[PDB]
Structures are given as structure tokens and as C-alpha cells.
């Protein structure tokens, strides 16, 4: 098994052959992570080493996976700075964990292109502003202001994608996630609708994001994940295609752990699994990270990493982190062997 992008420099290669091996491993098989936060945001929400540095106090643990996103899509810009909603200042710490030995992950709750200023007369940015079938289509028009916002975003995450490239960082990187839900411009326009039209434009999509980046751009570092919501219907609906995507994922929200629905639709990718984001529904500090780890182990084997998110969803603002994270079968930052 190969990278999607057959350019994929040694770093990204060796990355993805060591996560092809870990469902076979004796030892430890379930990376460990945490969402960092929003590069360039105030307060808890925003990127930083806090999430990691809570989770070393709590477990002595570092999680081996370092999550960030680019994109403040919530936020109006002026319109003409919509590249002003993408940062990437996250990068610095990010190199510094990939050189302790740790895996970068990107994602980027993007503006909506189709809006100038990102600005729909909502009350707030795009983000979670649907659009129709024609609207989409529009974003992959040459020549339109919807496709000219859309590479301008796509310009200032690949700028931060090349800068982790020029430092050998391969990236775990997650592109219009959750499509499968009808919360995101980019996603369903229906709960659980089996809308084919919005499923072809999303693929269109993703694709287009592909071989801008792969080839235009020339990032060799990229491990593509195909996440969607695990809580939702038509998943694989949206799936690009084997030759688009390197890493399955979900992102699973739940009070009860065992609940996963998708495992083996996603499994039919034949691509790493992980669940590439994670944590309870209610916020109220209950959720148990070690039932989840154990569960995991027990009844999704084939999954190699889970990703917590920041905020109430932290394993630090929940039950059992340590024994989570001290699992004789996880793997935390100090824990990864590449030759």
C-alpha cells in the first residue's frame, strides 16, 4: 500500500507504511492525539501546546498526534482578505512536535467561498451557511468569484502545507470533513438525505482540492483522510475514490463508546482507519476515555489512532485520561519506531 499522491516524498511513504502495519502489531497499535485549537484565535479554543502540556500533567503522557486547523469559517472577513480567515502561525509548534517524534494533523473549518467577505447577511461567517446544488457547482466553474475565493483559500492552506513540507513533516491532513452531515456549507444539503448530486459535487470537490495540492502545489507530505460524521448516514456516498484518499476516518461523538455505527463500511476502503475525532455528545465531564480506549481494542481493532477534540471534550475535562493513555496498546509521544 502506497500513497494516493504517487509523488509522496520518503517521510510521508515511511509514515504510511508504519500505519499499515500497526492492526498486525503485537505490541502497542492505537496512536493517541489531541486537537490542539484554531491557529490565531483568542482564548481556549485557539492553538497553543496547552491541550498536550493538560494531558502530560494528567497522564504524563504527551499524545503522539498534534492536531491543528487552519480556518476560522464562523468569522465574516472584508470581502477580498478571505485568506485573512486562514493562519497557519501553528506550524512553528507543530515542527518542533514532529521533531520530538510526534504526527501533525490538519484540518480547516473553511470559509464558504461562494459568499464574498464570507458574509451571507446570516449574522456570522459562511461556515454553516448551505447552499444549493447550483451555488456548489459554481465553486468548480473557471472564471467565477465563488472559484476565485476558493483558490485564494486553498493558496494560503497550501502555503502553510508547503511550509511544513520544506521541514520534512509529513501531515495527517482532513479536508472537508463531516460531509455527510448537513451542518457544513460543503456537506449534505439534508439530515441522512441521499441527495446524488450533492454527493457527486462533493467528490468533484475533494478532487479538485487533490490535484491542486499534488500537482500546482507540489505537496509530497500529504496523507489524505476521508472522515465523515459517524453519526450520520450515506458515509462512503461521498468517498471520492481509492486513488484520493490514504487514511479512513470518522469523527465519533457519543455517550456510549460501544455505539459506532460505519466500522465496517469504512473498513471497506482497505485503508487505515482511525477515528480522527472523538468525545462525548453531553459536556457535562463524564464520558470514560479508558471505556473508549477499551472498546476501541476490543471491538474496532483495525482502528490505529483516536483524536480527542479540545474544550469539554478533553480526555483532562473527563473520566480516566490516565489510564486511557498509560494502555499497555497505545501509542504516545516517545512510543514511534521508523526506520
Not at 89 to 113: E, F, M, R, T, Y
Request: hydrophobic share 35%.
Amino acid at each position: 500500500a502506497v500513497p494516493a499522491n504517487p509523488s509522496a516524498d520518503n517521510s510521508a511513504k515511511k509514515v504510511y507504511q508504519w500505519l499499515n502495519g500497526l492492526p498486525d502489531s503485537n505490541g502497542k497499535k492505537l496512536i493517541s492525539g489531541i486537537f490542539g485549537g484554531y491557529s490565531n484565535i483568542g482564548g481556549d479554543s485557539g492553538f497553543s501546546l496547552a491541550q498536550g502540556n493538560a494531558i502530560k500533567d494528567a497522564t504524563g503522557k504527551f499524545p503522539a498526534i498534534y492536531g491543528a486547523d487552519y480556518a476560522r469559517g464562523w468569522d465574516v472577513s472584508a470581502p477580498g482578505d478571505e485568506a485573512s480567515l486562514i493562519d497557519h502561525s501553528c506550524n512553528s509548534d507543530l515542527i518542533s512536535h514532529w521533531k520530538n517524534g510526534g504526527l501533525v494533523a490538519i484540518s480547516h473549518h473553511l470559509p464558504n467561498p461562494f459568499y464574498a467577505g464570507n458574509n451571507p447577511g446570516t449574522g456570522e461567517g459562511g461556515l454553516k451557511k448551505a447552499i444549493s446544488n447550483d451555488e456548489f457547482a459554481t465553486i468548480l466553474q473557471d472564471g467565477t468569484g465563488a472559484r476565485q475565493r476558493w483558490l485564494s483559500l486553498l493558496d494560503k492552506v497550501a502555503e502553510g502545507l508547503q511550509e511544513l513540507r520544506d521541514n520534512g513533516v509529513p501531515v495527517l491532513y482532513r479536508p472537508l470533513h463531516e460531509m455527510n452531515g448537513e451542518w457544513f456549507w460543503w456537506g449534505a444539503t439534508g439530515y441522512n438525505t441521499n441527495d446524488a448530486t450533492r454527493q457527486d459535487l462533493y467528490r468533484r470537490l475533494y478532487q479538485d482540492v487533490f490535484s491542486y495540492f499534488v500537482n500546482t502545489k507540489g505537496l509530497t507530505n500529504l496523507l489524505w483522510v476521508f472522515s465523515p460524521d459517524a453519526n450520520r448516514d450515506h458515509k462512503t456516498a461521498y468517498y471520492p475514490g481509492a486513488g484520493y484518499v490514504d487514511i479512513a476516518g470518522l469523527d465519533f461523538y457519543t455517550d456510549n463508546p460501544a455505539s459506532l455505527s460505519g466500522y465496517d463500511e469504512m473498513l471497506g476502503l482497505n485503508k487505515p482507519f482511525g477515528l480522527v475525532e472523538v468525545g462525548p455528545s453531553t459536556t457535562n465531564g463524564q464520558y470514560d476515555y479508558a471505556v473508549l480506549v477499551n472498546t476501541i481494542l476490543q471491538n474496532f481493532p483495525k482502528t490505529i489512532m483516536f483524536v480527542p477534540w479540545n474544550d469539554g471534550w478533553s480526555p483532562v475535562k473527563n473520566q480516566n485520561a490516565a489510564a486511557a493513555f498509560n494502555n499497555g496498546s497505545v501509542i504516545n509521544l516517545g512510543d514511534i519506531s521508523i526506520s
